[PDB]
Amino acid sequence: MQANFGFVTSQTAYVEAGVYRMRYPEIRYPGLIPVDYSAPEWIKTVDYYSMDGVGKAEWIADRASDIPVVGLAMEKATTTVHLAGIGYDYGLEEVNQAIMLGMNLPGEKANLARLVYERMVDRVAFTGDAEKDFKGLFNNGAVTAVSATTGNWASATADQILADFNLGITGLWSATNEMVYADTVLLPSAKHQIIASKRLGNEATETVLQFLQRANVYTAETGRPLTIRGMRGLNTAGAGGVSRSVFYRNSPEVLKMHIPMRHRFLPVQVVGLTYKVPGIFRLGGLDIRLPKEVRYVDGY
Amino acid sequence: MAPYNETYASDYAFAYEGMVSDIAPADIISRTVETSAGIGFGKIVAQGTSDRGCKADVSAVSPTAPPLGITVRSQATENLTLDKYPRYDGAAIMRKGVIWVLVTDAGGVVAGDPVWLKKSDGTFSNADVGSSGGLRLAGCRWDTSAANGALARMRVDFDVPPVAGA
Amino acid sequence: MAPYNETYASDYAFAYEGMVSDIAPADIISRTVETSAGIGFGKIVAQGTSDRGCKADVSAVSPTAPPLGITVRSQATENLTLDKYPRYDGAAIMRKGVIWVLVTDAGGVVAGDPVWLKKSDGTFSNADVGSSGGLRLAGCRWDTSAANGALARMRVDFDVPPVAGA
């Protein structure tokens, strides 16, 4: 590559009008984590309540006033919101040399700033910073992490694969007193693909990934297929650098992420033939309110 | 539609060779390039013979003749030299801000370290070379942990006189 | 209508613990608080282990590992710690301006004096303690005559390396 804003082109050549940017892994947080941005800007905390009630119903008589009563109680919890920023700057003759070439430097530095903002939001959502203690989905220390029943998923028959995969869903179903079913499953990339292309038995027609899509606790009784999604950063997240997989329910009442301020550009300040535009965005960390509805299994 | 040098990177890189990081203060100084070949972007420069010129040759800097500063990435530079300031050109030296530079050390650097200049080539490192061929830029410090041959940002102040180390 | 802590003062006070006094230059630096408890407003800070963090513990600073700067009074700080930067928060360190700080010396200070740091607690004074437990912030000076335990403004420059004093 080069950084000169100027290229030597021939007069008998065609200059194809296509901007090809370099490739990066996809954004992948939208649709895997619920994000709600409705808090007023420059708030400092976020509050949320609960509610629980008790009562009993008995048999009464034509005159005996045995009618019982009900009661209520509440509890409150809180989280926080922090500030960060990124922005660009440029010289005078740089932008004037890019203007007579039809480049629009101020508008070409905003596209990439938005892109890197999305990158930052993704990194905050799916892992932690250890500067604000923003525990991520893949490393939250408040959820239970168990080990697989001797399954390396390489040189392993599909009996072991099925047992290990159903271990996560059977271990989360009994952990909530048989009330909730796993909705989505995130596996390491290396092992989402070993299980994606092999047959159940020596003689079969379906793959061990296509078998657990259905034929599980969640998909047969309620009628939707289980979202076995293949993930990127789970390859070595684990107890001893071993792969982790995550089973969870994916509702706004389990997970949340608060972004009060999305991304802002402030006025330009001119200091001696240099223009400096600062950009700020104010967001908080990922919150896992129900830790018993998220399960980690290591060693796949 | 040029797909050469595609590496399918996990996420965006950090910076380029001589890019700055925004902050309120910066002494940026206009000098004229004196070397026959150009001068690279994140490089150290010495005091020229033209009373406002600079050279890329820092083999003879001393506490009595301290280095002048560090060039910055300009992005509008005559398109004949790829990423350099051509001969007879405004150089834009910086001597107060925070700038990304290239690391030349075996074990790498961490957050707060001394900055040592190797006079032979003009490369920055963590410790002295050991044969009266290195200076210490007294007011200078790192700001990033980086491995060998990687980009790290450092904070620089060239008004503090250098220290000779044998 | 709160009249507690009424002293019927003769005239307005001078400043608060960590307030700044206006001037064109200031390096204000964003760091993340690493100590379990917060960090006070006009306080010295050391270099953290998080590559951008800071600690209030300066018991091990040396000329090789100089202190990082001085925090400033923010006035928007989470209202759970009274006047502090809570854990995991932007710290706003300053290292160039003029700032009001607290004096810890028997005889007080006058206009132009050296600034000595006591590594044991992290308090500023006029002269060295005398048991290899004090540093001199080489580029630093006072700007007000003040008695013991009063507020005095000082001018600070942290790019100059400190001096060890036994």
Partner C contacted by B98 (CB < 8 A): no
**Partners of residue C46 on adjacent β-strands:** C55
Q: How is chain A classified by DSSP, letter by letter?
A: ----S-----SS--------PPP------BTTB--B--SPTT--EEEEE--EEE-------SS-------EEE--EEEEE-EEEE--EEEEHHHHHHHHTTT--HHHHHHHHHHHHHHHHHHHHHHS--SSS----TTT-TTSEEEE-SS--SSS--HHHHHHHHHHHHHHHHTTTTS-----EEEE-HHHHHHSSS-BSSSS-SSBHHHHHHSSSHHHHHH----EEEE-STTSS-SSSS--EEEEE---TTTEEEB-SEEEEEPPPEE-SSEEEE-EEEEE--EEES-GGGEEEEE--
**Partners of residue B90 on adjacent β-strands:** B32
| Residue bearing tokens 């003689």 | A203
**C-alpha to C-alpha distance for A261 and B152, rounded to whole angstroms:** 30
DSSP state of C162: P
Please say whether the beta carbons of C55 and C78 come within 8 A: no
| 3-class DSSP assignment, residue C10 | coil
**Partners of residue B133 on adjacent β-strands:** none
Question: Residue A42 corresponds to which tokens in the numbers above?
Answer: 């420059």
What's the N-to-C CA distance of chain C in angstroms? 53
> How far, in whole angstroms, is CA C91 from its chain's centroid?
13
> How far, in whole angstroms, is CA B52 from its chain's centroid?
19
**C-alpha to C-alpha distance for C3 and C16, rounded to whole angstroms:** 20
Residue from B27, B34, B78, B80 nearest B57 by CA: B34
* Dihedral Cα B89, A105, A85, C58, nearest 10 deg: 0
**C-alpha to C-alpha distance for A46 and A258, rounded to whole angstroms:** 8
**What is the phi/psi pair of residue A288, to 5°?**
-110, 100
| 3-class DSSP assignment, residue C154 | strand
The residues, any chain, with a CB within 8 Å of residue A18's CB and separated by 6 or more, are: B1
Residues of B in contact with A231 (CB under 8 A): none
Question: Looking at this protein, which amino acid is placed at residue A153?
Answer: W
The Cα of A44 is separated from the nearest Cα of chain C by a number of Å equal to 7
Please say whether the beta carbons of A287 and A65 come within 8 A: no
Question: Residue A273 corresponds to which tokens in the numbers above?
Answer: 């033939």
The residues, any chain, with a CB within 8 Å of residue C44's CB and separated by 6 or more, are: C58, C67, C69, C70, C117, C122, C124
Residues of A in contact with C52 (CB under 8 A): 131
Which residues of chain A come before a gap where C and the next N are over 2.5 Å apart?
none
CB atoms within 10 A of CB C109: 24
Question: Residue A246 corresponds to which tokens in the numbers above?
Answer: 């995550």
Question: Which is it for the CA torsion C120, C122, C127, C132, positive or negative?
Answer: positive
Rounded alpha-carbon distances, angstroms, from residue C71 to A61, A169, B140, C31, C96? 74, 50, 21, 10, 12
Using alpha carbons only, how large is chain B's radius of gyration in Å? 16
Q: How is C79-127 classified by DSSP, letter by letter?
A: TTSTTSB-SS-B--EESSSEEEEEB--SS-B-SS---EEETTTTEEESS
Burial call A250-289: b when 16+ CB within 10 Å, e when fewer: beeebbbbbbbbebeeeeeeeeeebbbbbbebbbbbbbbe
Report CB contact under 8 Å: C47, B111: yes
**C-alpha to C-alpha distance for A287 and A132, rounded to whole angstroms:** 13
**C-alpha to C-alpha distance for C160 and B158, rounded to whole angstroms:** 11
Partner B contacted by A15 (CB < 8 A): no
**C-alpha to C-alpha distance for A2 and B81, rounded to whole angstroms:** 10
Please say whether the beta carbons of C95 and C27 come within 8 A: yes
Rounded alpha-carbon distances, angstroms, from residue A294 to A109, A250, A253, C114? 40, 9, 12, 59
3-state helix, strand, coil in chain C (%, to 5): 0, 30, 70
**C-alpha to C-alpha distance for C97 and B24, rounded to whole angstroms:** 13
Question: Residue B95 corresponds to which tokens in the numbers above?
Answer: 């001597």
**C-alpha to C-alpha distance for A44 and A79, rounded to whole angstroms:** 9
Q: Which long-range contacts (CB under 8 A, 24 or more apart) does B104-107 make?
A: B104/B148, B104/B149, B105/B148, B106/B148, B107/B148
> How far, in whole angstroms, is CA B100 from its chain's centroid?
8
**Partners of residue B100 on adjacent β-strands:** B153
> How far, in whole angstroms, is CA A134 from its chain's centroid?
13
Please say whether the beta carbons of A37 and A121 come within 8 A: no
**C-alpha to C-alpha distance for B86 and B80, rounded to whole angstroms:** 8
Report CB contact under 8 Å: A115, B12: yes
| 3-class DSSP assignment, residue C155 | strand
Question: Residue B59 corresponds to which tokens in the numbers above?
Answer: 């083999």
Residues of B in contact with C162 (CB under 8 A): none
Rounded alpha-carbon distances, angstroms, from residue A273 to A39, C28, C129? 39, 22, 48
Please say whether the beta carbons of C53 and C68 come within 8 A: no
| Residue bearing tokens 């994000």 | A35
Question: Which is it for the CA torsion A154, A156, A157, A161, positive or negative?
Answer: negative
Question: Which three-class secondary structure string do you get for chain B?
Answer: CCCCCCCCCCCCCCCCCCCECCCCCCCEECCEECCCCCECCCCEEEECCCCCEEECCCCCCCCCCCCCEEECCCCCCCCCCCCCECCCCECCEECCCEEEEEECCCCCECCCCCCEEECCCCEEECCCCCCCCEEECCCEEECCCECCCCEEEEEECCCCCCEEEC
CB atoms within 10 A of CB A147: 15
Question: Residue B10 corresponds to which tokens in the numbers above?
Answer: 């996990």
Question: Looking at this protein, which amino acid is placed at residue A198?
Answer: K
Residue from C68, C69, C63, C64 nearest C42 by CA: C69
Return the ∠ at Cα A83 (arms to A77 and A87), rounded to 5°: 155
DSSP state of C159: T
The CA-based diameter of chain C, rounded to the nearest angstrom, is 53
Please say whether the beta carbons of A164 and C83 come within 8 A: no
Interface probe, candidates C35, C49, C52, C88, chain A, greatest A C-beta count within 10 A = C88
DSSP state of C146: B
| 3-class DSSP assignment, residue C48 | coil
The Cα of C82 is separated from the nearest Cα of chain A by a number of Å equal to 15
**C-alpha to C-alpha distance for A256 and A289, rounded to whole angstroms:** 8
Question: Which is it for the CA torsion B3, B9, B12, B14, positive or negative?
Answer: negative
**C-alpha to C-alpha distance for A210 and A158, rounded to whole angstroms:** 12
Partner A contacted by C89 (CB < 8 A): yes
Partner A contacted by C50 (CB < 8 A): yes
Residue from C17, C146, C2 nearest C74 by CA: C17
Question: Residue B18 corresponds to which tokens in the numbers above?
Answer: 């001589």
**C-alpha to C-alpha distance for A288 and A295, rounded to whole angstroms:** 12
Please say whether the beta carbons of B163 and B136 come within 8 A: yes
Residues of B in contact with C66 (CB under 8 A): 112
Residue from A203, A226, A196, A198 nearest A213 by CA: A226
The size of chain A, in residues, is 300
Please say whether the beta carbons of B156 and B82 come within 8 A: no
Question: Which is it for the CA torsion C52, C58, C59, C63, positive or negative?
Answer: positive
Question: Looking at this protein, which amino acid is placed at residue A284?
Answer: G
Rounded alpha-carbon distances, angstroms, from residue C83 to C16, C71, C88? 11, 12, 15
Partner A contacted by C86 (CB < 8 A): no
| Residue bearing tokens 């040759």 | B57
Experimentally determined by = cryo-EM
Please say whether the beta carbons of B50 and B1 come within 8 A: no
The residues, any chain, with a CB within 8 Å of residue A296's CB and separated by 6 or more, are: A143, A144, A145, A146, A244, A245, A246
Please say whether the beta carbons of C156 and C95 come within 8 A: yes
DSSP state of C144: S
